[PDB]
Symmetry: C5
């Protein structure tokens, strides 16, 4: 099984999001040896992920795309508007291009800084990165059956 | 009569989602004898369901598709964004392909683990599986009356 | 002289029925019978948008009505469906250009008993009459600006 | 500085919505003399506004469309679903037909009747009607400059 | 590199929004010398931003578009409906025209006037303006690579 995966990661709070990418790339290598290679693409924020996924999806080069970002909802500013536009936009792109788009765009409830939490979120994203790899593998596999 | 149904089930919490598939298949068999056959498709999570339904729908092979997942909203992480993208997504796929997509993608309010609840949710999903079979049958039948 | 497709969900049929009954009657009173209504049953609210689109695509109807009772509240979040449906109906009408009227009602968190049951039956009877006046009015208004 | 505007007003609570239309038409008259004429169209409720706007927009006759309605959210019944379909629907229509659609579809938080409030809302809508006219003029003008 | 950016600012509360445009233009000049020029467009409210973005995007002239508005959610009137149509609308536009659209459409939680807050919001918008500039540059660059 040989295919490429585009992983789009937002850079706001890159220290957290990076945990997921590292985790994701690792597991993928463990589980496939290296016959599945992952190309990384940086993007300013979550809001730039959908158009980037659509562009990349359109190239025909990837079997799946992952968009990861940490969207901290809460503070003086309402941020859920963005999270909604982004998760919905990703759904829209995959329905339109027919390339699976997996989401590692996490939105905590109203977390609130400190080595207390910082370690919580770093742990959590490491986990979600592993899960993401398992899903990516599984959905690619499953689609190539379902269409044969 | 005779036609096929694709049943897409998400694997996160499979132990609960399974109850719905079992019950759905069963009732379908009882009520039709066997003239309506159900093909099962696995998928990592809820978010993977819309594109899978669109791909399966576009094959012409099914009179109806059922998407079933358990989306536990609540915890440190906001999970409603995904439930929304998925329930809206399924709606969008059926409108675009014109193959009915029924939902058994359930989102409890903020359930909280323990043989207490676990039996509640296993029960509820078994029921929703039966209702879903009656719904599937009734909608396919009703559409073929309109249509012609 | 024209047809109206009335799509009614069957979950809680006892309540939705009030609306249809009411709708049909008023429609007969106000027009005589030159506007006929065809009824379509559907398992739940979620089945209404595709049904509306299919019917709207036939060219037979001047307007479609989707009626259902979507009880939001309980251990399960139900607003996701209410949302997909009301939005879906808007989407259908924008795409097909046949008016779709909504009698898809979502109470706040009603809670059973002859107390409420009579409340909701009354309310749906009213909404059904309003719905008929609306259907007549919009069909009429569109044929002018058309 | 001479064009037409379609004003779509919902009739539920017409007593309130009407304030907005009156005010809108007046200000438009004052600020333009009369070279900008407004055609009014009635519609049952807010839910009927997007398809009407699409139809009217697609005629080519109007430089802008205004949908106005009062959507009372709150009571035993959840009403926000409709407000969302409508405000989103108007956005969709303008994106698709490229004729500006301005919103005077107002949703108070959970107002609660009485000469107390009735005068509040009548006032507010008269205000939003004026603002709407300024907006209308400004956006039509701005578009004809840039593309 | 050398390309143009359309900056669409809403005029309601212009005193605050302006802070962001000022800041955005500056940082862009600082960081690029002047090889990247910004064209400003005024619009009544936030709700007028997506169509404007779409029209400007369709001209071919711009590498990116920025929409900036202050949407004060809260008061007797629900305002989130608009915020939602606008941010979703901008996302839609960029998906359809494929010209990046950046958002500086901010909605505070329920701020409440006074030199106390006024300076808070003016400060915050100045900051988001700088960030927007860095984002604009970065996404234009990154797209021309892929």
């Amino acid at each position: 099984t040989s295919f490429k995966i585009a992983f789009i990661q937002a850079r706001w709070h890159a220290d957290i999001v990076d945990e997921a990418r590292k985790s994701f790339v690792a597991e993928l290598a463990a589980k496939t040896g290296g016959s599945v290679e992952v190309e990384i693409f940086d993007v300013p924020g979550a809001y730039e992920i959908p158009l980037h996924a659509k562009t990349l999806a359109r190239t025909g080069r990837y079997a799946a795309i992952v968009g990861a970002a940490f969207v901290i909802d809460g503070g003086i500013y309402d941020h859920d508007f963005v999270a909604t536009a982004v998760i919905n936009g990703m759904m829209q792109v995959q329905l339109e291009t027919e390339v699976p788009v997996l989401s590692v765009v996490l939105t905590p409830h109203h977390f609130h800084e400190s080595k207390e939490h910082h370690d919580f979120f770093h742990a959590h994203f490491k986990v979600k990165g592993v899960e993401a790899a398992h899903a990516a593998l599984q959905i690619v596999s499953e689609r190539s059956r379902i269409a044969a």
